[PDB]
């Protein structure tokens, strides 16, 4: 129902310098921080107004942790190249996602070259290694008793600061923006026509758009584009079906969203 999530991406660059490390932090679907090792003077930078008042000590401390994490991912990428016996000529990607839900559940999982590598179990006391290489990482983290640090961060630090962030940005983070919706109509032939159901300017991003014909789902016939950012912190989505011209009214668009007290039902309105 409320979550703080961090995303790491470390990409090795053979002969084009040291690896690039990019980190972003979100509360729900609102980014509040970024770090890019390729920036001039890399440092933690606010991306939401409700962290701009945290003070220089907060931000210098965040920046220092980002730089250390960048350094560590350089060693980890080379370590991973060793595990898989990979050439130094190719680029490789180390991804990490961790965070906490409201305290409902914490998580911390990693990926190497787009595939699951290692993940902290839901009990926050052990890991699931995806292959024999990740078992090396698993054995390392067990010897360093790393599960308790993550359990300490997720059950304490993560929720404490998530609650603080939600309070500072109460006016934007805790009010859903309902989708502004309408149905458009585009003839395809003299016998068919596309009905597109729009949902615009909504927050958070989670939404469900379904077309029904005589009240039954058209999931097999519906074109559903991915939910996309508007650029202003709100999101957009649409769903479309091609209908026999003259029976448009048999089709209903149903949108579910947090910002709506009840699911909406729309038809095309000539």
């Amino acid at each position: 129902s409320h979550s703080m999530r961090y995303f790491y991406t470390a990409v090795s660059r053979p002969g084009r310098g040291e690896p690039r490390f990019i980190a972003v932090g979100y509360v729900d679907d609102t980014q509040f921080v970024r770090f890019d090792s390729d920036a001039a003077s890399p440092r933690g930078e606010p991306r939401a107004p409700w962290v701009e008042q945290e003070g220089p000590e907060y931000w210098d401390r965040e920046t220092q942790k980002y730089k250390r994490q960048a350094q560590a991912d350089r060693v980890s990428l080379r370590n991973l190249r060793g595990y898989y016996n990979q050439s130094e000529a190719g680029s490789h990607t180390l991804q990490r996602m961790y965070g906490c839900d409201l305290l409902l559940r914490g998580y911390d999982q990693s990926a190497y070259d787009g595939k699951d590598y290692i993940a902290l179990n839901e009990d926050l006391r052990s890991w699931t290694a995806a292959d024999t290489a990740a078992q090396i990482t698993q054995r390392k983290w067990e010897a360093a008793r790393e599960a308790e640090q993550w359990r300490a961060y997720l059950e304490g630090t993560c929720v404490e600061w998530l609650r603080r962030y939600l309070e500072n940005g109460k006016e934007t983070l805790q009010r859903a923006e309902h989708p502004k919706t309408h149905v458009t109509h585009h003839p395809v032939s003299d016998h068919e026509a596309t009905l597109r159901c729009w949902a615009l300017g909504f927050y958070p991003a989670e939404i469900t758009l379904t077309w029904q014909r005589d009240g039954e789902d058209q999931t097999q016939d519906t074109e559903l584009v991915e939910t996309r950012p508007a650029g202003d912190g709100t999101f957009q989505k649409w769903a479309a079906v091609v209908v026999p011209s003259g029976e448009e009214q048999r089709y209903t668009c149903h949108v579910q969203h947090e910002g709506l007290p009840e699911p909406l039902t729309l038809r095309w309105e000539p």
Partner: peptide, 11 residues
Amino acid sequence: ILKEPVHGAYY
């Protein structure tokens, strides 16, 4: 805030 990078916690 960021999880503290602890020493030796490389992959």
